[PDB]
Design an enzyme around this catalytic site. Structure first.
Site, mmCIF file in Angstrom:
data_model
loop_
_atom_site.group_PDB
_atom_site.id
_atom_site.type_symbol
_atom_site.label_atom_id
_atom_site.label_comp_id
_atom_site.label_asym_id
_atom_site.label_seq_id
_atom_site.Cartn_x
_atom_site.Cartn_y
_atom_site.Cartn_z
ATOM 1 N N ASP A 25 0.440 -0.975 -0.348
ATOM 2 C CA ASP A 25 -0.224 -0.010 0.375
ATOM 3 C C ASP A 25 1.068 1.332 -0.218
ATOM 4 O O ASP A 25 0.345 2.468 1.154
ATOM 5 C CB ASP A 25 -0.727 -0.346 1.014
ATOM 6 C CG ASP A 25 -2.143 1.514 1.230
ATOM 7 O OD1 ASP A 25 -1.952 1.921 -0.041
ATOM 8 O OD2 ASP A 25 -3.139 1.530 2.196
ATOM 9 N N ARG A 51 0.093 9.073 1.416
ATOM 10 C CA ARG A 51 -0.507 9.394 2.669
ATOM 11 C C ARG A 51 0.289 8.129 4.109
ATOM 12 O O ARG A 51 -0.381 7.707 5.397
ATOM 13 C CB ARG A 51 -2.112 8.332 2.149
ATOM 14 C CG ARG A 51 -2.352 7.584 1.858
ATOM 15 C CD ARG A 51 -3.745 6.855 1.511
ATOM 16 N NE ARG A 51 -2.906 5.746 0.445
ATOM 17 C CZ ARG A 51 -3.364 6.306 -0.643
ATOM 18 N NH1 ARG A 51 -3.693 6.407 -1.157
ATOM 19 N NH2 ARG A 51 -3.728 4.409 -0.834
ATOM 20 N N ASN A 52 0.786 7.391 3.312
ATOM 21 C CA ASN A 52 1.517 6.013 4.578
ATOM 22 C C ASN A 52 3.385 6.276 4.074
ATOM 23 O O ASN A 52 2.870 5.496 4.873
ATOM 24 C CB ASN A 52 1.114 4.556 3.702
ATOM 25 C CG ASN A 52 0.159 3.612 4.576
ATOM 26 O OD1 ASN A 52 -0.151 4.221 4.834
ATOM 27 N ND2 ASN A 52 -0.351 3.672 3.142
ATOM 28 N N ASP A 59 3.336 2.216 7.681
ATOM 29 C CA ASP A 59 2.479 1.443 6.713
ATOM 30 C C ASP A 59 0.585 1.604 7.665
ATOM 31 O O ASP A 59 0.877 0.669 9.251
ATOM 32 C CB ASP A 59 2.070 0.025 6.130
ATOM 33 C CG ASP A 59 1.000 -0.621 5.870
ATOM 34 O OD1 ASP A 59 -0.283 -0.156 5.606
ATOM 35 O OD2 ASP A 59 1.156 -1.773 5.682
HETATM 36 C C1 LIG Z 1 2.136 3.904 16.189
HETATM 37 C C2 LIG Z 1 2.756 2.568 14.932
HETATM 38 C C3 LIG Z 1 1.864 1.291 14.827
HETATM 39 C C4 LIG Z 1 2.159 0.351 13.654
HETATM 40 C C5 LIG Z 1 2.664 1.156 12.318
HETATM 41 N N1 LIG Z 1 3.439 0.488 11.333
HETATM 42 C C6 LIG Z 1 3.572 0.966 10.384
HETATM 43 O O1 LIG Z 1 4.271 1.733 9.966
HETATM 44 C C7 LIG Z 1 4.594 -0.322 9.641
HETATM 45 C C8 LIG Z 1 5.739 -0.212 8.104
HETATM 46 C C9 LIG Z 1 5.528 -1.035 7.353
HETATM 47 C C10 LIG Z 1 5.104 -2.596 8.261
HETATM 48 C C11 LIG Z 1 5.914 -3.376 6.609
HETATM 49 N N2 LIG Z 1 4.667 -4.721 6.082
HETATM 50 C C12 LIG Z 1 5.134 -5.556 5.188
HETATM 51 C C13 LIG Z 1 4.648 -6.817 4.451
HETATM 52 N N3 LIG Z 1 3.440 -5.963 3.954
HETATM 53 C C14 LIG Z 1 1.612 -6.651 3.846
HETATM 54 C C15 LIG Z 1 2.420 -4.561 4.925
HETATM 55 C C16 LIG Z 1 3.716 -3.788 5.448
HETATM 56 C C17 LIG Z 1 4.756 -2.923 8.791
HETATM 57 C C18 LIG Z 1 3.675 -1.967 9.683
HETATM 58 C C19 LIG Z 1 3.311 2.739 12.426
HETATM 59 C C20 LIG Z 1 2.620 3.282 13.533
HETATM 60 N N4 LIG Z 1 3.303 4.501 13.871
HETATM 61 C C21 LIG Z 1 1.919 5.325 13.141
HETATM 62 N N5 LIG Z 1 0.672 5.136 13.022
HETATM 63 C C22 LIG Z 1 0.263 6.029 12.604
HETATM 64 C C23 LIG Z 1 0.357 7.260 12.813
HETATM 65 C C24 LIG Z 1 1.793 7.481 13.019
HETATM 66 C C25 LIG Z 1 2.554 9.291 12.892
HETATM 67 C C26 LIG Z 1 1.749 9.947 12.910
HETATM 68 C C27 LIG Z 1 1.625 11.685 12.960
HETATM 69 C C28 LIG Z 1 2.611 11.764 13.452
HETATM 70 N N6 LIG Z 1 3.539 10.780 13.666
HETATM 71 C C29 LIG Z 1 3.169 9.660 13.094
HETATM 72 N N7 LIG Z 1 2.431 7.405 13.286
#
Ligand SMILES: Cc1ccc(NC(=O)c2ccc(CN3CCN(C)CC3)cc2)cc1Nc1nccc(-c2cccnc2)n1
Ligand SMILES: CNC(=O)[C@@H](N)Cc1ccc(OCc2ccccc2)cc1
Length: 264
Positions: A130, A134-135, A148
């Site tokens: 994705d 926006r991500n 993500d």
């Molecule tokens: C709090 C949190 C919890 C989980 C996540 N996760 C991820 O960001 C992430 C990134 C990469 C992967 C890798 N993945 C590989 C497999 N395929 C299917 C999916 C992607 C998975 C999760 C982020 C966050 N961080 C987050 N989330 C929402 C908003 C914000 C935020 C907003 C404003 C200012 N600073 C931070 N920060």
């Protein structure tokens, strides 16, 4: 916990939960203070999908992927804790920025950083699925990280329904649309759309094009036009990311090397 074990597991009470982040646009994600370090963090709260995401994040570390700081997954309510990025999501940042400050070279820098994160995911055999502005998040000094947010069922017409799933059609590679095949090459397609978003300071892709006719136009070799001011070489990279056959698209290793070169 005590090693006498999961090094990521932390003390729920080390964190002061504050308000839901970005006025509720990320779902159950809260601003928090990790009191011990005086540090603002982002905290996602709630199972198998949630525990699987935590496990994936423990396997990834890169200066342009958002950093897992800790988890609370012994008992509910479960937390996933990451750094907080000062300037918020990249899409809004580009729409709202000072365009004299966020010049062509800064856009180049943002694209290079994201391709670096993607070259790392690629090397590790992960698929984003994705990728879009926006991500992505923006920190100080135009630091950019890929994230993500699981935006599918939070967000308008950005995502639209498919078999229990919602897909962002205008970011989705033709083989994903037609055969539900997702791969690092379908991330390469999406990256090309993300580059277009960056080049236009956050405009919506295929503006006014109805969603039902996107695949058809793609199949007829329609592609988005070069944005005003986008260098020819950057557009050429975009078009390569939008090759119809996924095996014809470049690798993120190649893309990053092409940006690294321009950036240097
Ligand atoms: C709090 C949190 C919890 C989980 C996540 N996760 C991820 O960001 C992430 C990134 C990469 C992967 C890798 N993945 C590989 C497999 N395929 C299917 C999916 C992607 C998975 C999760 C982020 C966050 N961080 C987050 N989330 C929402 C908003 C914000 C935020 C907003 C404003 C200012 N600073 C931070 N920060
Ligand atoms: C001497 N000057 C030079 O060589 C410049 N042409 C160096 C340069 C190359 C590519 C750039 O890309 C801008 C951009 C990247 C990604 C998305 C949109 C725009 C910017 C500057």
């Amino acid at each position: 916990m005590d090693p006498s074990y999961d090094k990521w597991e932390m003390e729920r009470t080390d964190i002061t939960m504050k308000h839901k982040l970005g006025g509720g646009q990320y779902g159950e994600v809260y601003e928090g203070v990790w009191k011990k370090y005086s540090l603002t963090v982002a905290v996602k709260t709630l199972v198998e999908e949630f525990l699987k995401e935590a496990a994936v994040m423990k396997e990834i570390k890169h200066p342009n992927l958002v950093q897992l700081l800790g988890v609370c997954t012994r008992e509910p309510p479960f937390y996933i804790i990451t750094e907080f990025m000062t300037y918020g999501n990249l899409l809004d940042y580009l729409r709202e920025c000072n365009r004299q400050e966020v010049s062509a070279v800064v856009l180049l820098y943002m694209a290079t950083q994201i391709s670096s994160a993607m070259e790392y995911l690629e090397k590790k055999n992960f698929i984003h699925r994705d990728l879009a502005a926006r991500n992505c998040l923006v920190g100080e000094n135009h630091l950019v990280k890929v994230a993500d947010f699981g935006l599918s069922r939070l967000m308008g017409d950005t995502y639209t329904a498919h078999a229990g799933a919602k897909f962002p059609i205008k970011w989705t590679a033709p083989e994903s649309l037609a055969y539900n095949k997702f791969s690092i090459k379908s991330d390469v397609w999406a990256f090309g759309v993300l580059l277009w978003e960056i080049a236009t300071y956050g405009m919506s892709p295929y503006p006014g094009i109805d969603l039902s006719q996107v695949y058809e136009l793609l199949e007829k070799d329609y592609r988005m036009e070069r944005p005003e001011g986008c260098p020819e070489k950057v557009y050429e990279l975009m078009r390569a990311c939008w090759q119809w056959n996924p095996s014809d698209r470049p690798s993120f290793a190649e893309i990053h090397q092409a940006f690294e070169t321009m950036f240097q």
